[PDB]
Amino acid sequence: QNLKSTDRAVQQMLDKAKREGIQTVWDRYEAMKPQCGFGETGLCCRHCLQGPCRINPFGDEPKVGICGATAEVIVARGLDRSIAAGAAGHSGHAKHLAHTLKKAVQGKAASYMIKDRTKLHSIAKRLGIPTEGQKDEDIALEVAKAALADFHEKDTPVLWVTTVLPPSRVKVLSAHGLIPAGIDHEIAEIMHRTSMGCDADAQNLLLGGLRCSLADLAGCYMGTDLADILFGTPAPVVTESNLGVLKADAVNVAVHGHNPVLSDIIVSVSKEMENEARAAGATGINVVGICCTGNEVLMRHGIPACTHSVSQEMAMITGALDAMILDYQCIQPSVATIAECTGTTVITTMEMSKITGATHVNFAEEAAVENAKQILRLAIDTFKRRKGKPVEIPNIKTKVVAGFSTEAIINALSKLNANDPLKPLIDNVVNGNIRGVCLFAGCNNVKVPQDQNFTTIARKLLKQNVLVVATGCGAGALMRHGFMDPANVDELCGDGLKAVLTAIGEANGLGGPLPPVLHMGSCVDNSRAVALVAALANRLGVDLDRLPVVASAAEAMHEKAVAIGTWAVTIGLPTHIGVLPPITGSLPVTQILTSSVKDITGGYFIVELDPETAADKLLAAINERRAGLGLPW
């Protein structure tokens, strides 16, 4: 099973699924082989009813689409629609939070409130909204109105792009016409220009894709900002991860999907319902996380992470998962079918994300506590139904220190330099104790043995003194293999990095180091890494494409991860992707995305499926940035 996942708890559940005859994502992948080589290379188009069209990567006809679309047009149009789909997911998420904040401060959703007033005021000031002598509710109404205004054209560009990057980077982007006019405006313009008989020039298409990726960045940054206002900015927390966080004698409830508007309420209301659970024979309600909504409640409340991404079905295979509470994105719809076998109650809550065979309980923010109570009573009823049933929870878990928002990182560094917190970090980049920074982001993918690329690349970078930060299911992979436990610093980190993590943790009163990898949150919280990187660029007086900072979507899957990788390149970063994207059928498009975009934005993709080689390429990219700053490497 180690060919499927490197996680030992997942391996144990794969054995259980096998002997019980429950089909998994790895079995559905095996049944799909061999996969179509036209789609793998990007050489397929279904954008009109004269299709499907394809182009042979090599050989004879077909060489061109029926309307005359070339390989480079077809590959660029498909990539652009992927970017637009990812932007559409993050900005649906962000819009959901904007409408929740508006409702809250208008007295229409009493379950929600302004928790981080300090963040509210800093965002308002960044946006140019006056705060002095204003009521908090009025300030918040204006921030929610500004959030919703960024979805359409208006007399300013998207402010969650132009106010969050340094002016020099905004100027580079503006010079190439890449600043978005409105988030949903760009998504629609992508779908237009990629439709039949429209844009048919690869460079023009890809410039439109870079602009739409910045609409995705705006939706990510907006979602972090609004979730911090409503639910609190994360601070360091300790918890646990992997399937051993499930408890046979508890009501086990996973929150899965993305939006904390739902997850955060499940967590607080589950606390009020402890006695009701105990009357049912349980010890209480054990809320556990899956995917990004799990990261959101891990970061803010220390809720333990059960599993992530490709292995999500395995939590159900234990037999102890009483409920799986869903909103949207990254939920394998197989869960509705596996539930019939495992007894889990799978519950959907959003009108635009239903799964045939799952129970639907409408969740309205205006009725959030009552709707949560209804959902959790379903969970309790399910617990009661499995009294006396054996379960198989692998007794496997790791310790996880997390909660490293950019505010938390700056506060930690301020213990070493109160009025110039970024300087101790920059000092140690200059003296070589920190070689550079790498952000691990994005999904697992069934084509890659689960977590193998994240852990292989992270181990090599940590030994080379790279400061490693992580989000999403990249953070999930690293946490489940011990990379967020400070007890593993001696084993994993080079001496320079160890000295730095130790000096910071000791200054913060822990009698020990920060963990080997800093968890910066969910996938929208890739925006927190942008805030940190932009702050370092501003402090140094250089643009982001001069910093020794890289990114790695080492096991990418979702269209959201394609959008995030593309805005990482657009803001100036060398960005690794560890799975094959559907671009190899066009050498001109590949050369744009891996080489000539450097002359436009300073960033570039690094496509490399072998993780040791990928680590070497990421180190060479870091070191080339060090050399360009005049630093040893």
Q: How far is the CB of 446 from ligand SF4 (least distance, A)?
A: 8
**Pick from 128, 167, 177, 628: which binds a copy of itself (CB under 8 A)?**
177
Q: What is the rounded CA–CA span in Å between residue 481 and residue 416?
A: 30
Query: Which one, 52 or 588, has the nearer CB to ligand FES?
Result: 52
Is 198 annotated as belonging to a binding site? Answer: no
Q: Does 47 bind ligand SF4 (CB under 6 A)?
A: yes
Q: The tokens of 339 are what?
A: 């539930």
Please report the sign of the dihedral spanned by the C-alpha atoms of residue 134, residue 140, residue 142, residue 143: positive
Here the tokens at position 57 are 């990567």
- From 18, 23, 57, 67, residue interacting with ligand SF4 (rule: CB under 6 A): 67
Q: How far is the CB of 196 from ligand SF4 (least distance, A)?
A: 4
Distance between CA 57 and CA 43 in Å, rounded?
7
Residue 565 binds a copy of itself, judged by CB under 8 A: no
- What's the Cα-to-Cα distance from 106 to each of 63, 101, 374, rounded to whole Å? 59, 9, 25
What amino acid occupies position 35? Q
| Sole binder of ligand SF4 in the list 17, 43, 45, 253 (CB under 6 A) | 45
Residue 69 interacts with ligand SF4 (CB under 6 A): yes or no: yes
Asked whether position 63 contacts ligand SF4 by CB under 6 A, the answer is: no
Binding pattern for the stretch 119-148 against a copy of itself, x by CB under 8 A and - elsewhere:
-----------------------------x
Of residues 521-540, which lie at the interface with ligand SF4 (CB under 6 A)? none
- From CA 576, how far away is CA 607, in angstroms rounded? 6
| Residue 235 buriedness (CB in 10 A; 0-12 / 13-18 / 19+) | middle
49 binds a copy of itself (CB under 8 A): yes
- Shortest CA distance to 563 belongs to which of 615, 610, 524? 524
Nearer CB in complex with ligand FES: 43/317: 43
Contact present, 436 and 466 (Cβ < 8 Å): yes
Q: 438 labelled as ligand-binding?
A: no
503: alpha, beta or left? (left if phi > 0; alpha if psi -120 to 50): alpha
Which span (1-9, 46-54, 246-254, 461-469) binds ligand SF4, by CB under 6 A?
Answer: 46-54
Contact region with ligand SF4 (CB under 6 A), list: 42-50, 161-169, 546-554, 573-581: 42-50
- CA-CA distance, 287 to 250, in Å (whole number)? 9
Q: How many CA atoms lie within 13 A of 374 on its CB side?
A: 14
Nearer to ligand SF4, 226 or 335 (CB): 335
CB of 431 to ligand FES, least distance (A): 51
- Confirm or reject binding of residue 66 to ligand SF4 (CB under 6 A): yes
- Distance separating alpha carbons of residues 468 and 515, to the nearest angstrom: 10
Interacting partner of 482 out of ligand SF4, ligand FES, a copy of itself, none (Cβ under 5 to 8 A depending on kind): none
With residue 632 as reference, give the H or E element that holds it.
Answer: none
Instruction: Indicate the residue among 563 and 619 with the shorter CB distance to a copy of itself.
Output: 563
User: Which of the 8 DSSP states describes residue 592?
Assistant: I
Q: What would the x/- binding string for a copy of itself be over residues 588 to 617, using CB under 8 A?
A: ------------------------------
- Going from the C-alpha of 68 to that of each of 72, 191, 421, 524, the distances in angstroms are 11, 19, 57, 38
Verify binding: residue 191, ligand SF4, rule CB under 6 A.
Answer: no
Among ligand SF4, a copy of itself, ligand FES, none, what binds residue 628 when CB lies within 5 to 8 Å by partner kind?
none
192 contacts ligand SF4 (rule: CB under 6 A): no
Give me the 73-102 binding string for a copy of itself, x by CB under 8 A, dash otherwise: x----x--x--xxxxxx-xx----------
State the minimum distance, in angstroms, from the CB of residue 52 to ligand SF4.
6
CB 507 within 8 A of CB 478: no
Which residues are near ligand FES by CB under 6 A? Answer: 36, 38-39, 44, 46, 52, 54
**Nearest-angstrom CA–CA distance, 426 and 539:** 9
482 conformational bin, left if phi > 0, alpha if psi -120 to 50, beta if neither: left
Exposure string over 362-377, b if 16+ CB within 10 A, otherwise e: ebebeebeebbeebbe
Give the residue numbers of the binding site: 36, 44-45, 48, 53, 67, 258, 292, 330, 443, 473, 523
Residues binding ligand SF4 (CB under 6 A): 45-48, 50-51, 53, 65-67, 69, 196
Give the residue numbers of the binding site for [Ni-4Fe-5S] cluster: 258, 292, 330, 443, 473, 523
